[PDB]
Amino acid sequence: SEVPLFDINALGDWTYLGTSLPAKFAKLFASILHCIDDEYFLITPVEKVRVQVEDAPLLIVDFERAQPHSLLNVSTSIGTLHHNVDIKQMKLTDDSVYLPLERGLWGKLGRACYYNFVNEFNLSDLN
Ligand code: NA
């Protein structure tokens, strides 16, 4: 065990060595976060380290289509922004809905945007 030094809880909040990271620090580290074969890492040339993730690495708190019927832009609780997000590729558990983002990362839909997400569906999203 490399016990991971970075932890992301189910609500998307990060710690390092057990200390809470401010959102902007979580956003800095998220820029180099990947999920490879179901395991999470921060990846740089010199340092490649593990991250423990309770649920999803990112919590989606807002979304919009760039244009009618387009793919989605989403933003997260730590302030990251993601483009070209495809409703058709969503994944459900019995508890939550997840959307696929870059670098193998999935974003969990936050409770406060759930109903708005359901309302957003267009039949064209299945095309
Ligand atoms: Na709709």
Author numbering: 29 to 155
Verbatim from the authors:
To extend the structural coverage of proteins with uncharacterized biological function, we targeted Pfam protein family Pfam06938 (DUF1285), for which we determined the structures of two representative members. The first structural representatives of the DUF1285 family revealed a novel fold consisting of repeated motifs. The structures revealed a conserved core with domain duplication and a superficial similarity of the C-terminal domain to pleckstrin homology-like folds. The conservation of the domain interface indicates a potential binding site that is likely to involve a nucleotide-based ligand, with genome-context and gene-fusion analyses additionally supporting a role for this family in signal transduction, possibly during oxidative stress.
The Sbal_2486 gene of Shewanella baltica OS155, a psychrotropic marine γ-proteobacterium, encodes a protein with a molecular weight of 17.7 kDa (residues 1–157) and a calculated iso­electric point of 4.8. The crystal structure of Sbal_2486 was determined to 1.4 Å resolution using the MAD method. The final model included a monomer of 127 residues, seven ethylene glycol molecules, one sodium ion and 231 water molecules in the asymmetric unit. No electron density was observed for residues Gly0 (which remained at the N-­terminus after cleavage of the purification tag), Gln9–Cys28 and Glu156–Gln157. The two domains of Sbal_2486 (residues 29–84 and 85–155) show close structural similarity to SPO0140 (Cα r.m.s.d. of 2.8 Å over 127 residues with a sequence identity of 25%). Thus, although the β3αβ3 repeat described for SPO0140 is present in the N-terminal domain of Sbal_2486, the loss of the C-terminal meander results in a truncated version of this repeat in the second domain. Sbal_2486 crystallized with one monomer in the asymmetric unit and PISA again suggested a monomer as the most probable oligomeric form. The largest packing interface buries ∼760 Å2 of solvent-accessible surface area but is not predicted to be stable for complex formation. However, the results of anSEC coupled with static light scattering (SLS) for Sbal_2486 indicate a dimeric form in solution under the test conditions. This suggests that either the observed crystal-packing interface is stable or the oligomerization state is dependent on the buffer conditions, forming a dimer in the anSEC buffer but disassociating in the crystallization solution prior to crystal formation.
